[PDB]
Amino acid sequence: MGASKLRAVLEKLKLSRDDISTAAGMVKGVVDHLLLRLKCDSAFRGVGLLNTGSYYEHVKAPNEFDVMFKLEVPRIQLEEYSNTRAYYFVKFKKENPLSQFLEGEILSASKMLSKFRKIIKEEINDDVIMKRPAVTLLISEKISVDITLALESKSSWPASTQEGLRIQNWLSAKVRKQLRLKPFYLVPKHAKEETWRLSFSHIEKEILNNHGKSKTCCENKEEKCCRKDCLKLMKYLLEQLKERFKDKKHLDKFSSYHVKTAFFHVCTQNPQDSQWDRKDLGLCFDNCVTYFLQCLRTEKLENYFIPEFNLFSSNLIDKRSKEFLTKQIEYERNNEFPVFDE
Ligand SMILES: O=c1ccn([C@H](O)[C@H](O)[C@H]2CCOP(=O)(O)O[C@H]3[C@@H](O)[C@H](n4ccc(=O)[nH]c4=O)O[C@@H]3COP(=O)(O)O2)c(=O)[nH]1
Ligand SMILES: [Zn+2]
């Protein structure tokens, strides 16, 4: 695939620019209102908007939004669950604003989520309609907004992330150090329970928006790379393939985060900006796909922050599904990607 062809596909996808402001206005208004009203509670006093992009996490999809509400929870004691390395029980090390959500010694996620959804449903009452881990809203019978509650911890990152975030040869060890000083998050998610999974969406956004070895990367004509284009192309490939086979539960468990993680690993493999030259968009992309296929074939896709947490384990995704996706992707690459046609 020629780089200009790929960029033609991407530019063809960018045709939603005029609508972006119109949607962002309404969504921004509703979300801000929900924040204003939601701040009134004692438990959700320090609630806030994490704002990690505020754009779409799905390309092809201008109607679906994803927002995340952070809550400062000072002095927390995490307890690892069954060596899952990613899922934890939240404890407290007396006066606790979240004491009402305590089911014994462990902070209950279901009750807190219930109070959350209850307040939000109390505020939508006064053309927004709530739908039956996340809380989905429907603005103007068109726009979908996924709201996620996340606990914020300004403590040092858990031990399972010690050997994660290998960006030393890419973005330098200095940046890794300053990044690991930032807080980490916890989203309500069960393991394959009342457990919480680690989340570093802010870090992902940060490394994506500051992706070059050079500080001036993508700031001048001579230093424009094709990292973001590769990520977008991968995401679009997976999205189109999932769209073609929506009638099957094979590709249901495959999503953009797998693609993003694989992309991050590829970035680690190719730390130099010269390895992501603009004119080489065709090759770089071809690399990414290949690596992704490897992750499908070897059934190994380590979380970029939690190396011992495998996203492509047999327990999470069965071999058959990965083989099917492999077949489809390989066909696509072998036939100049006909799935990008429209
Ligand atoms: O921060 C992250 C995000 C994703 N992952 C892994 O993929 C996780 O295994 C993901 C891999 C797919 O994730 P997703 O973003 O594509 O899609 C999510 C997400 O859309 C929704 N969800 C989950 C939590 C939440 O608080 N609010 C939500 O709406 O259920 C989907 C499936 O999530 P899983 O646990 O079923 O498996 C991580 O490890 N850390
Ligand atoms: Zn760049």
From Swiss-Prot:
Its membrane topology: Peripheral membrane protein
Nuclear export signal (motif): residue ranges: 10-15
Effect seen on changing K14E: Strongly reduces stimulation of interferon production
Glycyl lysine isopeptide (Lys-Gly) (interchain with G-Cter in SUMO) cross-link, chain position(s): K70, K174, K205, K215, K300
EC number: 2.7.7.86
Keyword list, A-Z: Acetylation, ADP-ribosylation, Antiviral defense, ATP-binding, Cell membrane, Chromosome, Cytoplasm, DNA damage, DNA repair, DNA-binding, GTP-binding, Host-virus interaction, Immunity, Innate immunity, Isopeptide bond, Lipid-binding, Lipoprotein, Magnesium, Membrane, Metal-binding, Methylation, Nucleotide-binding, Nucleotidyltransferase, Nucleus, Palmitate, Phosphoprotein, Transferase, Ubl conjugation, Zinc
Impact after mutating K12A: No effect on stimulation of interferon production
Modified residue annotations for (Microbial infection) Deamidated asparagine: N51, N210
Reactions that this protein is recorded to catalyse: GTP + ATP = 2',3'-cGAMP + 2 diphosphate; GTP + ATP = pppGp(2'-5')A + diphosphate; pppGp(2'-5')A = 2',3'-cGAMP + diphosphate
Post-translational modification: The N-terminal disordered part (1-160) is phosphorylated by AURKB during the G2-M transition, blocking CGAS liquid phase separation and preventing activation. Phosphorylation at Tyr-56 by BLK promotes cytosolic retention. Localizes into the nucleus following dephosphorylation at Tyr-56. Phosphorylation at Ser-256 activates the nucleotidyltransferase activity. Dephosphorylation at Ser-256 by PPP6C impairs its ability to bind GTP, thereby inactivating it. Ubiquitinated at Lys-235 via 'Lys-48'-linked polyubiquitin chains, leading to its SQSTM1-mediated autophagic degradation. Interaction with TRIM14 promotes recruitment of USP14, leading to deubiquitinate Lys-235 and stabilize CGAS. Ubiquitinated at Lys-14 and Lys-205 by RNF185 via 'Lys-27'-linked polyubiquitination, promoting CGAS cyclic GMP-AMP synthase activity. Monoubiquitination at Lys-174 by TRIM56 promotes oligomerization and subsequent activation. Monoubiquitination by TRIM41 promotes CGAS activation.
Recorded superkingdom: Eukaryota
Amino acids binding ATP: S54, E64, F65, D66, S201, H202, I203, E204, K235, S256, Y257, H258, V259, K260
Extra remark: The cGAS-STING signaling pathway drives sterile inflammation leading to type I interferon immunopathology in severe COVID-19 disease caused by SARS-CoV-2 virus infection. Tissue damages in the lung and skin lesions are caused by activation of the cGAS-STING signaling leading to aberrant inflammation. Endothelial cell damage is also caused by activation of the cGAS-STING pathway: SARS-CoV-2 infection triggers mitochondrial DNA release into the cytosol.
Protein name: Cyclic GMP-AMP synthase
Gene name linked to the record: CGAS
